[PDB]
Design a protein around this ligand. Structure first.
Ligand SMILES: [Cl-]
Ligand SMILES: [Cl-]
Length: 124
């Protein structure tokens, strides 16, 4: 299996672009990251920052996770992100997504050693 850390990297990181400059970004990335393989993953967020900057969030503001756990951290600054969400008329395997580009603080759950992000809790 994929480790938790690697799975986060694959689903969330997109350091190759500064921001989504197309309405087709999500359709293309969701497919390329293999997120539409067995089904259409309904929601996903990609972060357009360096991996090092994202990992560093694990040393930032400690806050509660939506589930109540306390291993969540909120980034001190805003980051470039792209929210990908399935449209109402999307059907596997013809997955279709709405692309929404924004600048928001990210909140992630961190774990392990090294202590890195394992799940994307939300953005503010
Ligand atoms: Cl790993
Ligand atoms: Cl994969």
């Amino acid at each position: 299996k994929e480790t938790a850390a690697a799975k986060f990297e694959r689903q969330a990181m997109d350091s190759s672009t500064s921001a989504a400059s197309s309405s087709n970004y999500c359709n293309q990335m969701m497919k390329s990251r293999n997120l539409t393989k067995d089904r259409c993953k309904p929601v996903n967020t990609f972060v357009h920052e360096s991996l090092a900057d994202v990992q560093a969030v694990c040393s930032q503001k400690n806050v509660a996770c939506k589930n109540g756990q306390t291993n969540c951290y909120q980034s001190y600054s805003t980051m470039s992100i792209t929210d990908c969400r399935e449209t109402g008329s999307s059907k596997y395997p013809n997955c279709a997504y709405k692309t929404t580009q924004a600048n928001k603080h990210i909140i992630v759950a961190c774990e392990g050693n090294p202590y890195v992000p394992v799940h994307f809790d939300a953005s503010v």
